[PDB]
Design a protein around this ligand. Structure first.
Ligand SMILES: Nc1ncnc2c1ncn2[C@@H]1O[C@H](COP(=O)(O)OP(=O)(O)O)[C@@H](O)[C@H]1O
Ligand SMILES: Nc1ncnc2c1ncn2[C@@H]1O[C@H](COP(=O)(O)OP(=O)(O)O)[C@@H](O)[C@H]1O
Lengths: 223, 261, 223, 131
């Protein structure tokens, strides 16, 4: 099961899932230095410190008092990423490659301006929130939940994650940055103007192409 | 408005005919061979051809199962018979089958299903529809997945049919045409005119029985020898009026466990 | 959903909910100084302490050791405040709004004689004690509860808050004044005498009206 | 007051009037019939449930049930003072569908009682010895 299932989930999901799952495995056993991945903001303000530009963006020390919350977001992500590849993003992997980059640079600049350290939950819910507004208008009712009406998902999920734990900074910016990009990528061009002045370069398409309908070979004679 | 009528089932198949009374087309500036646009619920359109009928009334239109399914309507609903005889010839068509009908068939589907179907018929087709072809041994249904020009096109003697490709997975919004209906019962003409008169009103329009304040039926008991088609009357009635047929069985209730039955 | 629902709340209650949620928001993320709201009672004894007469009375530094309590009472406040405002109180908003003023003044003086700083819960449970007793004789049985008989809520609710937490004094002082005010405003006039010698001045009704019946479009049809 | 409709029986309520309270309707008067309808309040019994004017074909038998049950249910104290034994079981028998659970529903709704029906099939099939 471990073999074929890992290669059958979409490549984007299969690498992203393993990107942030195997790293805590090293932390719990503790071979590499757990103190080596902090992303000090004040150090970045004084020196460039090319040592840790992205390194501390995947390491989370899940453990005794830092579990639960980290574990559950893996459940929804695994339950919900596979949906949002199929949420019209299957035909646009390059587009899906892009706003992942845009979101990652958007959270980190706010992650560097103010002094939080672990930017781990934000990248999970930001794409999840973006999935909600972009794939609204369905009714969902799980076994241990209520019969809440549709199109309430982005706000209802905003409560459970917030009240468990804290650190109001990451929840607010993560949803807001998804909101502004939601208006920018989708609503801004058809509202007043300001079209897609962030188009993905052909080099990204050259790396991985999209999917197109092929017509094949035709055959039909007179009558 | 002189457009909204009631529908009823057909006899002579022919997935592209509707029956209208003579005065109706006479007063609706209609002529023979005029293609018409039919529009119903969910903003769906189906293109058909009209022809005379001997015993068709003014307000009733007779049409078969396949046309009804495309419009997403049921028996006794209302439809728009908006006419428009202007369709530009299609250039190249792409017709592909549904997955759960071509199990272990393969071969060239074009020359044994589609070839005798479109031959000298000039069938007017519209994007997104479904039609059923009576094969040599099965009944294979296809789905027009692309057309040029989109979406209105009439099949011409000179087109390009691309029947190549993997079958489309069955969607969630359909009736599954290969299922039971009122035309799949024979020898029960009188009885199926009693189970249908005492059940359509509480199930089709429920709100009326609340306002009128009378007593609906609450139980029907069909009896007869085994194998005469009793569970097929209940399955046919549920599939056409629109309901939630939920079968509970005799033997597996009696043999679950102790007091958990 | 946030737009209409927030405006759907009655203004007095919608003012109530905002004060109970916005003030916690500032404290937790650390915008205002957490120590800036403590209500030093001994300072009130010596000097007037005009700087913070009421500001520290809304201060609640929620923490992940008692936050579960902070959620249940707000959950209790949210759904029951709807019940009490429509329970014989729709036509008298001014009478209800002023009755809150007595429930607030009574605790704040008692909070000066003794030395408690966290003055949030006692007012919440006081009106809840008031709400149950003036809306007695109703059978209630929630999903995770038993089939206990009616007119038992103010006594049993005094047990649940007592075990979870402590500070026995606030529970006692909360129950008594609502019990006395029930005797004062409602039972004293019909027991022996001493009617409403605190009546609502016209200045209130100038601020906001109470209610007025509507006739409708009349008909004149006879023979 | 109850108005006999085309197929129902709609009952209204005089919720406000002027000059209060005695105001006979006159050929030149104003009727305000618009507004959201009032919730059915408690205390009073509805005017639509069964009564003595809702049975026919049983004028004799409903005379025997009425004389035997009107006294113990209307004057509970008098039987205590006189100290005579009252009836304690009545057995109505007949074909099904003839209106037996309607004779016992009209008697409770008119003399004033606490009709508490217990059913046959539901008692018999609850669970083992818990029935
Ligand atoms: N018009 C018809 N009248 C009666 N039986 C039919 C008719 N058409 C088909 N049948 C067959 O009768 C069978 C009835 O299903 P089944 O449940 O086996 O018997 P029953 O309905 O009597 O329990 C179906 O398998 C179907 O093949
Ligand atoms: N005067 C009457 N005599 C007999 N039946 C009546 C009379 N008036 C009404 N009914 C009908 O009888 C029904 C009630 O009888 P039912 O509940 O069957 O008693 P039982 O179950 O003991 O036979 C009512 O639905 C009503 O329609």
């Amino acid at each position: 099961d471990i073999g074929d299932w890992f290669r059958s989930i979409p490549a984007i999901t299969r690498y992203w899932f393993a990107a942030t799952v195997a790293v805590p495995l090293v932390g719990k056993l503790g071979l590499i230095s757990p103190a080596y991945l902090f992303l000090w903001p004040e150090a970045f303000l004084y020196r460039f410190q090319i040592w840790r530009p992205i390194t501390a963006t995947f390491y989370f020390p899940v453990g005794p008092g830092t579990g639960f919350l980290y574990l559950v977001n893996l459940y929804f992500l695994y339950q919900y990423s596979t949906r949002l590849e199929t949420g019209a993003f299957d035909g646009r992997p390059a587009d899906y490659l892009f706003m992942l980059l845009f979101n990652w640079i958007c959270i980190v600049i706010t992650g560097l301006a103010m002094d939080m350290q672990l930017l781990m939950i934000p990248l999970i819910m930001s794409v999840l929130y973006v999935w909600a507004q972009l794939n609204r208008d369905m009714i969902v009712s799980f076994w241990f939940g209520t019969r809440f009406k549709a199109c309430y998902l982005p706000w209802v999920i905003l409560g459970f994650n917030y009240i468990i734990g804290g650190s109001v900074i990451n929840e607010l910016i993560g949803n807001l940055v998804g909101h502004l990009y939601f208006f920018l990528m989708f609503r801004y061009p058809m509202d007043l103007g300001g079209r897609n002045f962030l188009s993905t370069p052909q080099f990204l398409y050259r790396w991985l192409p999209s999917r197109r309908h092929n017509w094949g070979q035709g055959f039909r004679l007179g009558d | 408005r002189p457009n909204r009528l009631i529908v009823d089932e057909a006899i002579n198949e022919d997935n592209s005919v509707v029956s209208l009374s003579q005065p109706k087309m006479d007063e609706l500036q209609l002529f023979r061979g005029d293609t018409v646009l039919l529009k119903g619920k969910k903003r769906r359109e189906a293109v058909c051809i009209v022809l005379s009928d001997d015993t068709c009334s003014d307000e009733k239109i007779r049409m078969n199962r396949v046309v009804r399914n495309n419009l997403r309507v049921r028996l006794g609903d209302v439809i728009s018979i908006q006419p428009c005889p202007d369709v530009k010839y299609g250039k190249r068509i792409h017709v592909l089958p549904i997955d759960d009908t071509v199990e272990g068939i393969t071969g060239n589907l074009f020359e044994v299903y589609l070839k005798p179907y479109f031959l000298e018929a000039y069938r007017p087709i519209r994007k997104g529809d479904i039609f059923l072809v009576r094969g040599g041994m099965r009944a294979v249904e296809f789905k027009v997945v692309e057309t040029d020009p989109s979406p209105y096109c009439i099949v011409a003697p000179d087109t390009v049919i691309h029947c190549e490709g993997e079958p489309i997975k069955r969607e969630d919004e359909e009736e599954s045409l290969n299922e039971v209906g009122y035309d799949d019962i024979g020898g029960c003409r009188k009885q199926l005119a009693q189970i249908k008169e005492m059940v359509e009103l509480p199930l089709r329009h429920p709100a009326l029985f609340k306002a009128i304040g009378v007593k609906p039926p609450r139980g029907i008991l069909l009896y007869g020898p085994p194998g005469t088609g009793k569970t097929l009357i209940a399955r046919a009635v549920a599939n056409e009026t629109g309901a939630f047929f939920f079968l509970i069985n005799g033997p597996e209730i009696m043999s679950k466990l102790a007091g958990e039955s």
